[PDB]
Design a protein around this ligand. Structure first.
Ligand SMILES: Cc1cc2nc3c(=O)[nH]c(=O)nc-3n(C[C@H](O)[C@H](O)[C@H](O)COP(=O)(O)OP(=O)(O)OC[C@H]3O[C@@H](n4cnc5c(N)ncnc54)[C@H](O)[C@@H]3O)c2cc1C
Ligand SMILES: Cc1cc2nc3c(=O)[nH]c(=O)nc-3n(C[C@H](O)[C@H](O)[C@H](O)COP(=O)(O)OP(=O)(O)OC[C@H]3O[C@@H](n4cnc5c(N)ncnc54)[C@H](O)[C@@H]3O)c2cc1C
Ligand SMILES: Cc1ncc(C[n+]2csc(CCOP(=O)(O)OP(=O)(O)O)c2C)c(N)n1
Ligand SMILES: Cc1ncc(C[n+]2csc(CCOP(=O)(O)OP(=O)(O)O)c2C)c(N)n1
Ligand SMILES: [Mg+2]
Ligand SMILES: [Mg+2]
Lengths: 608, 605
C-alpha cells in the first residue's frame, strides 16, 4: 500500500511553500488538515476565536516580513465568518490564501437544487467570487496540491490579493500514490518595461527635470513591489519633495528632509498646500483613492500635470480624465528604470527645485501637524497631542497597527516613523475590529514579537474575543484603547448632517462600551489608565517595558474634533459648499489662504 | 415644496409593514436611515456590537411571536459582517429582511471595473445571491418603498427566508413627492389543493386508516405555516404516535400521551426504535435532513411506507427513491384538508393503533432519555442529568435558546416543554455563537422578556461582545455556560478518527477560554458556578429569580461522552443502522427491540 492521505500531502506542500503559520478554527470540515499539519510540525496553527480574525491576521502577517500565511476554515459558518477579512485583503492588495473545508464532494456542486449542501455546507467559492483573485473547489484528489500552489502564486502575482481554495472533507481524507500528484508551473512573469512604457519613463524624467514644483506621491504598491529601499536615493537624486499615502507612511523616514507628510481629506494642512500648489505630481504605487484626492478631479493640483504608476491597469486609468501618463508597471521596475535613465548618457539636466523645497518647509513651519486647533478640550487629553507624546516612546523596531476611529485618524495625521519601524491598518475596507487581529498577525510573523495596537472603545468590541488568543500565547501586544463614549467619528457625521441629538453613537443614544481595565483584569492582562497628563509619561514608559500583553485606556473628550478635515461648509448666503482640497476645516482666515495659494484662492473659497 | 426624504418614507414603510424593531450598527452608509427611523419613533433600533448578531437576532425575534424584524447594515464590513446570520436564516427557513446601505449609486454597479465601489463598498447583493430568497439594489428613489414591501413579502412567502435590500446613500438622502412612490401588491396566495394534491391527501388518509404502526414526524414547517394548533386534534383523531424534529420540539407538549420524542443521529433510543419499527411514516413540515434520517435511505424505517409533505418542491422529492407520496403543499393547508376528510360524514374507519401505542410506551420504559449511560463521570456532573434537573426550574412561559455543543446536544436529547414554552436554535447552519444573539432577539420580541440561554465555553467567544448589549438594556437573559476545557464535540470527532492527542480543541492543544465569572463581574453581571449537586438547586433558583442578566458557569468532565449517538464502530469499520445507537446495547436486547429482528450490519458489532 504505497498511498498517502491527501491531507498529509497538503501539509507537506505548505512546508514546501514556506507557509509557517496558519490561522483558523477547527471543525469536521478541516479536522483532517488540522491533524496532518499538527503531526508534521512545520506550520504552526494559531487557533483564533472568530474566523474573521484569522482572515485579518494573515494580512499583517504577510506585511511584516513578506511571508504568506494561510487561513484554515471549516464548513458552513467557519467559511462565512471569514468573508470580512477576505474583503479587506482584496481592498488593500494583500496576498493570503484561505483553505476552506466543505461537505463531502457528492454534495458540492452548484446545480444542487437544495438550499444547502450536505449537512451545513454552501458554495463558499461563489460567495467570494467578486472579492478574491481566484477561487477553486478541489474535486480530484490528484489536484489538491496543484490548486494550493496555484492559489499561492495567484495571490502573490501582479496586484496581490486573497485566493480561496475549497477542499471537501472526502478529498482531504482520501489516499493516493504521491507520484500521481500534479503540480502547478507558474507562467513566465511579465515584462512590464515594454517600448511604450519605457517611453513613458522618459517622459516622466523630462517632466521631473523641467518641473519647478514637483511632488512625488508614494504608496504601498512600492513596498508590495519590494522597492522601498530605492526611495531615498531617488528623492535625493531628483531633489524633489515627496508625500506618502497613509498606507505608505513607513516607507521613508518621516523626518527625511524631502518628505513632507500626507495629503487628502484628512490631510495635513502643509501637505495639502504642497500638493495643491505643485506644477507636477508623480504618483507611484498609490491608489489615489477618494480620501486622498477628494471629490473633484478638476480641483486637484490645478497647476499641475499628474502622472500615475500602478501595476493594475484599471487603477492606473481610473482618473484618466485628469491624468497624463497612465503607467501600467510594477513600482520597483519603474523606479529602477527611472534611476537608470537618470544615469543615461543623454539624461536631461535637472533644474533646481531649491525655491520650492524652501516653500515646502515654510508651509510646515506655518502649519504644524499638531497645532492650536488640537488644544486639550475642556482639559481632556487631545488625541493628536497624545499621539505626539506617544511617538517619542517608540522602540527602534516599533511596529504599530491601528483600528479605525481616533486611532486611525489621529495616528496617521501625527505619527512619525524612521527606518526599522512599521505602520499598518486596513484602509481599503476600513473595518472596525481590525486592530487586534492585525496585532496577532504581526506578533506571530516576528516569532511572538512586540506590537503596539492603537484601538478604540467601539472597534475593540468587534473582535473582543481575541483578547483570549493574546493572553493564551502571552503575546507582547501593547493595546491602547481610546475611550470617548462611543462612536466619535459618526457623532461628527450625524451632527454635520442633522444638527440634532446623537442617534446610535453614544451611551444615551444606544451604544455603550465596557470598562476595559476591568475586562483586562478578568483576562489576567495588566492594565493602566491615562486620564490626564500627570501620569502619562510614567505610564507610557511602563507599558513599553512590559514583556507580555498589556492594556492602556486613554480618556479623551467625548466630542473632540477630528481635524484638519475636508468638510462641508456654509457660504455667507447659507448655501452648503464642499470646498477644494486645500481648504481644510476648521477654515483658516481667507487672507492667509490667499497668500498660501500661488494663483490666489479658488472661487469656492472666497465666500466661505 | 411637497417633497420628503426617501429615508423618512422608508421609516413610514417600516411602520406600515409592522416592523417594530431593527437591529444593526450605524455608519455613513445608513446614517440617514438611522436618523429617520429614530425620529419617527415607531421602530426601536437595537444597536449591537457586531452585525452578525443583528442578522441572527432577527431570526429568533420572528420565531417568538411571528413579527418580522429588520437588520440595518452599513457599507462595507457593515454588510460582510452580516452574512453568517443570513445563511443561518436561509438554512432554517426563517423570514427576515436586511436593509443594507452602500456608497453613492454612481459607483454601485457590477460593471464597475475596480476592486471596490466608491470608498469602501462592494456588491452586497451578489455576495448573498445563493443564500437568500431575493436581493435588490434600489437605484430609483421612487422604488425604495416598493422593494421593501416586496422584500418582506418574499421573505414570508412560500418557504420563508431572508431577503436583502441594498439602498445606496444618495438614494436615502434624496427627496421626492410621496405620491410618486410605487407600491408592491402581493399576488394571491397559491391554491395547493388541486385535484392531484387532493388525491394525494386521500391516499395519505387511507394509509393512516389501515396502518397498524404509524408515526407522524412533525417539523417546524408546521409552526411556520401557522398550523401548530391543529396538531392535538389531528393526533387524537388518528390515535397515532408522533415524533417531533429538533426544530419542532416546542410544537406539542413533550408529555402528550402520543408524543414520543425525537429521532435521528442524536436521537433518543426510544424514538429511534419507534421510527425504525413503524409501518407508515407521515412527515409534515420536516426537512428529513441527514441528522434526522442517517446516511442510507434503504435503512430508514425498513418496514414502512414513507410520505412527505413540504412546501418546497425540491425538499419534498429529494428522497423520492424511497418515499411514496411526495406532497408539495403548505403544512397548515394540508393538515386542514386531512382534518376535513377525517370529520366528514363519509370518513373512512380508522383501525386501532392501541397495541402500537402500548409498544411505544414500553420502548420509553425500557430506554429512558436520561439513563445509565449518563452517570456522573469521575466526580463531575453529567450534562444530561444537569439538563434534567434544570428542566424542573422552567417558568410557565419559559423560552430557551441554545448555542451548539453540549447545550445543543444535551438540551435537545433531554429537555421537555409544555404548551406556552419555546425552544430555538440554529440547526440548519449550526454556527457557534448563535446563542447570545438568539437571546437578544427573543427578549426584544417579548418587550425585554426573559430568556434562558444554554451556551458553551467555545461558542460564547464568537459573539462575546453582545454581553455589553445585554447589560446596556438590562435584559433578563439567564446565561448558562458549559465549561469543558474547549471544544468537546471536536475532541470526540478527532479521537474517533485518530485515537491520538487532541489538536486545536483544548488548552494544551491551542484553544482556551476565559473565566466567565470574572468576565461577568467586569461587565457588572452577577455570576454563579455549579460544580456539584449540593449547590445546584439553590443556584438554579437564584438564577431564575434574577430580574436582570445572569451568568451561571456549569463545570462538566472535559472528555464527557455525548450519547446516545449513531457512531462508527470497529467490527473493519461499520456505520450501523439508525436504531443501533452508541454505546451499543447487547445484541440480544436489540434483537428483541426490533419487530423484524436486527439488521445484518448489527449482528457483528
Ligand atoms: C476615513 C479615511 C480617511 C483617509 N484619509 C486619508 C488621507 O487624508 N490621506 C491618505 O493618503 N490616505 C487616507 N486614507 C487612506 C486612503 O484612502 C487609502 O485607503 C490608502 O491608505 C492609500 O494608500 P496607498 O495608495 O498607499 O494604498 P492602496 O490603497 O492599497 O493602494 C496601493 C496601490 O498599489 C498598487 N500596487 C500593488 N502592488 C503593486 C506593485 N507591485 N507595483 C505597483 N503598484 C502596485 C495597487 O494596485 C493599488 O492601487 C483614508 C482612509 C480612510 C478610511
Ligand atoms: C449535530 C446536529 C445533530 C442533530 N441531530 C438531530 C437529531 O438527532 N434529530 C433531529 O430531529 N434533528 C437533529 N438535528 C437538527 C436537524 O438536522 C435539522 O437541522 C432540523 O432541526 C430538523 O427540524 P425541521 O425539519 O423541523 O426543520 P427544518 O430543517 O428547518 O425544516 C423545515 C422544513 O419545513 C418546510 N417548510 C417551511 N415552511 C413550510 C410551510 N409553510 N409548509 C410546509 N412546509 C414548510 C421547509 O421547506 C423545510 O424543508 C441535528 C442538528 C445538528 C447540527
Ligand atoms: C464593521 C463595521 N461596522 C460599522 C462601521 C461604520 N463605522 C465607521 S467609524 C464607526 C465608529 C467608530 O467608533 P470607535 O471605534 O469607538 O472610534 P472613534 O471614532 O470613537 O474613535 C463606525 C460604526 C465600520 N467601519 N465597520
Ligand atoms: C463559526 C463556527 N466555527 C466552527 C465550527 C465547528 N464546530 C462545531 S462544534 C465546535 C466546538 C464547539 O465547542 P463548544 O462551543 O465549547 O462546545 P462543546 O462541544 O465543548 O460543548 C466547533 C469548533 C462551527 N460550528 N461554527
Ligand atoms: Mg469611540
Ligand atoms: Mg466546550
Amino acid at each position: 500500500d504505497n498511498k498517502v492521505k491527501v491531507a498529509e500531502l497538503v501539509a507537506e506542500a505548505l512546508e514546501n511553500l514556506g507557509i509557517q503559520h496558519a490561522f483558523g478554527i477547527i471543525g469536521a470540515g478541516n479536522v483532517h488538515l488540522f491533524e496532518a499539519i499538527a503531526r508534521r510540525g512545520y506550520t504552526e496553527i494559531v487557533c483564533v476565536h472568530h474566523e474573521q480574525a484569522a482572515c485579518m491576521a494573515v494580512q499583517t502577517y504577510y506585511r511584516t516580513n513578506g511571508r504568506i500565511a494561510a487561513a484554515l476554515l471549516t464548513t458552513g459558518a467557519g467559511s462565512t465568518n471569514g468573508v470580512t477579512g477576505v474583503v479587506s485583503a482584496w481592498a488593500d492588495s494583500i496576498p493570503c490564501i484561505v483553505i476552506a473545508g466543505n461537505e463531502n464532494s457528492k454534495f458540492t456542486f452548484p446545480e444542487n437544487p437544495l438550499r444547502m449542501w450536505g449537512v451545513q455546507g454552501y458554495d463558499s467559492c461563489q460567495m467570494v467570487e467578486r472579492v478574491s483573485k481566484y477561487q477553486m473547489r478541489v474535486t480530484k484528489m490528484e489536484r489538491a496540491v496543484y490548486e494550493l500552489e496555484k492559489g499561492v502564486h495567484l495571490a502573490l502575482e501582479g496586484r496581490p490579493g486573497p485566493t480561496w481554495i475549497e477542499i471537501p472533507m472526502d478529498i482531504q481524507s482520501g489516499r493516493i500514490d504521491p507520484a500521481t500528484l500534479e503540480h502547478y508551473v507558474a507562467p513566465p512573469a511579465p515584462d512590464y518595461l515594454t517600448p511604450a512604457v519605457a517611453a513613458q519613463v522618459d517622459s516622466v524624467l523630462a517632466a521631473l527635470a523641467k518641473a519647478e514644483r514637483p511632488v512625488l506621491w508614494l504608496g504601498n504598491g512600492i513596498r508590495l513591489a519590494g522597492g522601498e529601499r530605492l526611495l531615498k536615493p531617488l528623492l535625493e537624486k531628483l531633489g524633489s519633495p515627496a508625500l506618502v499615502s497613509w498606507a505608505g507612511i513607513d516607507m521613508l523616514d518621516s523626518s527625511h528632509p524631502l518628505v513632507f507628510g500626507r495629503a487628502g481629506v484628512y490631510g495635513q494642512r502643509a501637505a495639502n498646500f504642497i500638493l495643491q500648489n505643485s506644477d507636477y505630481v508623480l504618483a507611484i504605487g498609490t491608489r489615489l483613492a477618494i480620501p486622498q484626492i477628494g471629490y473633484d478631479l478638476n480641483e486637484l493640483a490645478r497647476l499641475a500635470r499628474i502622472d500615475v504608476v500602478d501595476i493594475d491597469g484599471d487603477e492606473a486609468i481610473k482618473h484618466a480624465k485628469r491624468t497624463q501618463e497612465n503607467i501600467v508597471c510594477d513600482a520597483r521596475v519603474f523606479i529602477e528604470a527611472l534611476l537608470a535613465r537618470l544615469n543615461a548618457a543623454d539624461a536631461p539636466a535637472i533644474a533646481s527645485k531649491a525655491d520650492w523645497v524652501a516653500k515646502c518647509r515654510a508651509y510646515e513651519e506655518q502649519f504644524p501637524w499638531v497645532g492650536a486647533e488640537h488644544a486639550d478640550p475642556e482639559g481632556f487629553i487631545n488625541s493628536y497631542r497624545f499621539m505626539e507624546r506617544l511617538n517619542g516612546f517608540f522602540k527602534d523596531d516599533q511596529v504599530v497597527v491601528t483600528d479605525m476611529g481616533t486611532a486611525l485618524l489621529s495616528g496617521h495625521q501625527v505619527l512619525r516613523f524612521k527606518e526599522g519601524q512599521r505602520f499598518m491598518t486596513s484602509t481599503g475596507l476600513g473595518e472596525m475590529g481590525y486592530g487586534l487581529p492585525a496585532a496577532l498577525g504581526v506578533s506571530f510573523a516576528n516569532d511572538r514579537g512586540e506590537v503596539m495596537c492603537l484601538n478604540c472603545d467601539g472597534g475593540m468590541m468587534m473582535n473582543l474575543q481575541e483578547l483570549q488568543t493574546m493572553v493564551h500565547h502571552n503575546l507582547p501586544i501593547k493595546l491602547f484603547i481610546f475611550n470617548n463614549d462611543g462612536y466619535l467619528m459618526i457623532k461628527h457625521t450625524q451632527k454635520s448632517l442633522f444638527k440634532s441629538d446623537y442617534v446610535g453613537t453614544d451611551r444615551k443614544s444606544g451604544v455603550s462600551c465596557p470598562d476595559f481595565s476591568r475586562l483586562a483584569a478578568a483576562f489576567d492582562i495588566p492594565a493602566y489608565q491615562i486620564r490626564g497628563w500627570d501620569e502619562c509619561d510614567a505610564t507610557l514608559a511602563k507599558v513599553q517595558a512590559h514583556t507580555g500583553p498589556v492594556i492602556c485606556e486613554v480618556f479623551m473628550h467625548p466630542q473632540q474634533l477630528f481635524s484638519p478635515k475636508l468638510g462641508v461648509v456654509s457660504r455667507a448666503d447659507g448655501t452648503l459648499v464642499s470646498p477644494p482640497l486645500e481648504d481644510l476645516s476648521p477654515l483658516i482666515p481667507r487672507d492667509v489662504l490667499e497668500q498660501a495659494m500661488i494663483g490666489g484662492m479658488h472661487e469656492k473659497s472666497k465666500t466661505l
